[PDB]
Write an enzyme that holds these catalytic residues in place. Structure first.
Site, PDB file in Angstrom:
ATOM      1  CG  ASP A 167      -2.117  -0.812   1.116  1.00  0.00           C
ATOM      2  OD1 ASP A 167      -2.185  -1.621   0.161  1.00  0.00           O
ATOM      3  OD2 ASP A 167      -2.997  -0.685   2.002  1.00  0.00           O
ATOM      4  CG  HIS A 221       2.321   0.312   4.327  1.00  0.00           C
ATOM      5  ND1 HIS A 221       2.118  -0.482   5.440  1.00  0.00           N
ATOM      6  CD2 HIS A 221       1.157   0.970   4.113  1.00  0.00           C
ATOM      7  CE1 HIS A 221       0.880  -0.312   5.874  1.00  0.00           C
ATOM      8  NE2 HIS A 221       0.274   0.558   5.083  1.00  0.00           N
TER       9      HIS A 221
HETATM   10 ZN    ZN Z   1      -2.617   3.182   3.269  1.00  0.00          ZN
END
Ligand code: ZN
Ligand code: CL
Length: 216
Positions: free
Chosen positions: A24, A172
């Site tokens: 992400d 991430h």
């Molecule tokens: Zn996010």
């Protein structure tokens, strides 16, 4: 092939013995190294991308697609969607659609809500716009362990939740330690288990033709 629900939180892959590694908030300057690693292991991942990051790094969006990975929507601005009106939630999605249409030639049908925050209004928007809503069943919490001495704790959480049957994993690619250390640990373990390491759409049984649509 399967019908996959719109506007309904999906946490888990349905194809047996698959795992979906997902990333992400990018693209980031670390994303190219992560793509190199994914190609070494001959696996596919999913990237839920943001607006300014995609506009700043259009060539990374293209490289993600050319190397067989899935691009999903993470909204333009990364706002917690329940803090927004119906119209504002729509705009968070369509503004990123404008960016992705121009960079990769189509728009995603899969999205992940910022912070996994949803409410009825958010789900109504996603139903109305034709988005599959994806959260996760493994959460590395890598944002909180982004240092060489802490990142092993994200791997411990990953392994424990994988053993518990989690199979759709949040990290991430904005975090250096995720790319330079954690991703290889995850890829070694999934390879050791002989799992099929694939995109979210594929791990739900969805043909790639259905992960994207033409411009509205
Ligand atoms: Zn996010
Ligand atoms: Cl409203």
């Amino acid at each position: 092939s399967r019908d996959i629900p719109f506007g309904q939180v999906i946490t888990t892959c349905t194809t047996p013995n698959t795992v979906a590694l997902t990333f992400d908030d990018g693209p980031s300057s670390y994303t190219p190294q992560l793509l190199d690693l994914l190609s070494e292991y001959k696996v596919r991942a999913t990237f839920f991308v943001l607006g300014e990051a995609s506009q700043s790094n259009p060539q990374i969006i293209q490289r993600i697609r050319q190397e067989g990975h899935q691009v999903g929507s993470h909204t333009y601005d990364h706002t917690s969607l329940p803090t927004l009106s119906y119209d504002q939630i729509v705009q968070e999605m369509t503004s990123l659609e404008s960016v992705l249409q121009s960079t990769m030639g189509d728009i995603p049908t899969y999205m992940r809500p910022p912070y996994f925050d949803v409410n009825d209004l958010t789900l109504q928007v996603m139903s109305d716009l034709g988005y599959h809503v994806v959260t996760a069943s493994i959460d590395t919490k890598d944002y909180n362990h982004n240092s060489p001495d802490l990142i092993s704790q994200s791997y411990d959480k990953f392994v424990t939740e994988l053993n518990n049957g989690g199979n759709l994993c949040l990290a991430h690619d904005t975090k250096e330690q995720t790319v330079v250390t954690l991703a290889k640990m995850m890829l070694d373990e999934t390879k050791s288990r002989g799992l099929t390491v694939t995109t979210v759409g594929d791990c739900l049984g969805d043909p790639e033709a259905s992960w994207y649509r033409s411009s509205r």
